[PDB]
Design a protein around this ligand. Sequence first.
Ligand code: V2M
Ligand code: V2M
Lengths: 303, 305
Amino acid sequence: SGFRKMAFPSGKVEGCMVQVTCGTTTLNGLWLDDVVYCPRHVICTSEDMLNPNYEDLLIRKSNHNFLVQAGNVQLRVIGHSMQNCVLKLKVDTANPKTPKYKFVRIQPGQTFSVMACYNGSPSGVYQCAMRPNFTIKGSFLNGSCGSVGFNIDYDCVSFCYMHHMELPTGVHAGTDLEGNFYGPFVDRQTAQAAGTDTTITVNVLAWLYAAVINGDRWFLNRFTTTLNDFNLVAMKYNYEPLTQDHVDILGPLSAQTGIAVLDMCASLKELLQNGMNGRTILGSALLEDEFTPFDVVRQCSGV
Amino acid sequence: SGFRKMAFPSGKVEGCMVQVTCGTTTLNGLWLDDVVYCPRHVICTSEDMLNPNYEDLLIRKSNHNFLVQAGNVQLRVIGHSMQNCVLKLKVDTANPKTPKYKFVRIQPGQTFSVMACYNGSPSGVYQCAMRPNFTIKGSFLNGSCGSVGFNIDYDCVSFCYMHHMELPTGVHAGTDLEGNFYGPFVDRQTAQAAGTDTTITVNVLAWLYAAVINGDRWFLNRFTTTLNDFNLVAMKYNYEPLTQDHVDILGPLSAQTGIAVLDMCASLKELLQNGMNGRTILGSALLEDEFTPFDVVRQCSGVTF
Ligand SMILES: *[C@@](O)(CO)[C@H](C[C@H]1CCNC1=O)NC(=O)[C@H](CC(C)C)NC(=O)c1cc2c(OC)cccc2[nH]1
Ligand SMILES: *[C@@](O)(CO)[C@H](C[C@H]1CCNC1=O)NC(=O)[C@H](CC(C)C)NC(=O)c1cc2c(OC)cccc2[nH]1
């Protein structure tokens, strides 16, 4: 038993991180097959990053302008191209540690493992959720650009995120592996704001089911609610609406605990209107929304 | 910026996880060089685990009773010995993925990364802190025994934990890599209860230093205190007493901020005696105690490996 923010084992990705240097700008790259993926602002200088004409800056670059280091060996760039915000450096050597992989675009509310890296060296691993406003709440410092987020199914690594930016509020933004940003952000050196940060309701309910599966039921109550009446209150608190598909996804957790989804919604509605006083749920004083129903099923099934 | 419970990259440990099976009992083991370490109760059957005599049970076992598998590839066992609650099996193959490593026994309050494993396959990684009652708030299912906890310093993997037990309260217990349990627990199929837990003071202070580094310093006061005075007061609030090693590991954060350790102790004492007064620290009204000073430095100045 127990419930914990859990990331996938990172070994398959560690063998793909490399360092990419252009002029005086260094960040991380992802070496899969004979291609190295990294954020395209590596080609920028401190002055270019203010308003970079990336296609203009790119054509002016030569293959030898890119220093790609994989551990100790230095890889030979035999080609360069650009797919949106992701720079694609073709190398003369295919990464032998390339696992089975696929590029996917995560949906808001879904989770993934972040492998934070600096100078091409993996430094830490943690779990994140793609928030409804397409930001994530990570831990990234100078030099973390190029770090990727991923999920692992069987032996297939599904890459979904490459890090680019830290907003003035302290949350983070990035792209999928096709170079398309999550959210309305742009890779220029400017202070940018996200949309309003709504709460992932289906995850909050999953996390409440986890608390019950782990012996905590102080927030439960005898009231019930309709889907619509719950969503009225939820939206009033800047919570995403609960769809019937969300209800269906919570099915397994409902059966296991014996608490109907709409019954859990009545508890959550009371928590939102009353607060938690001084009490805690699974050790937290706030309502956690970065746990998916699948995260809870994985850890609490059969407990 | 940002603060998260962050585990070490697990690749160096993944290449060392294997499956050990005796009869029908299976669990995980740690393959380093030509030795596999695992919990000794793998020799037990379901009924044996009730009141086991491990010396008597082990005498009836031979090298050929042990199934050790890397994936689906068996590693022939050519030797076996018992050290405390850890079984050691010599195999005929030296793990080519063996990293630089050492075995360490950590202290309460220290943190490590747990490699959750099932049937020898790594499944998840997450950070834990050894509680002052020698339990960890883990996430472990059936078949998780033999999962190890580790830290990575440079290129050296320091193994400090091997999983054995889930207590009734849902927390977890286990040993170091020499088979010595953390806390007053024994590997028997019986409900055991840990001592009353307490808050990890040195980590709370580190958390406060983290706040000061980030401009949130409303809680600093003009008071100071002695180490003995603070310890006697902290014990009244369920806080662990500080050691000399605790003051020392707070050294870097103390120098970086300019706040002496005993001054921040006096500030924490204020927070315990009068509460938070409706305010928060780093966004939370709850004092966090699972971040060590190293974790705080690690996330304010990203170290690599
Ligand atoms: C990459 O490492 C750079 O290669 C970096 C991410 C780091 C920075 C510290 N925290 C992180 O997560 N990304 C950046 O520095 C990006 C670069 C653009 C894509 C060109 N910009 C920002 O993070 C950025 C610019 C800001 C600004 O305007 C100057 C105001 C406020 C915040 C802000 N952040
Ligand atoms: C190992 O996986 C078994 O090899 C397992 C730990 C797992 C199982 C679910 N959660 C975990 O952390 N360990 C056990 O099952 C141990 C085995 C002993 C070392 C022999 N037992 C317990 O953890 C145990 C026995 C208990 C009991 O007695 C019947 C009452 C209450 C709790 C309890 N836990």
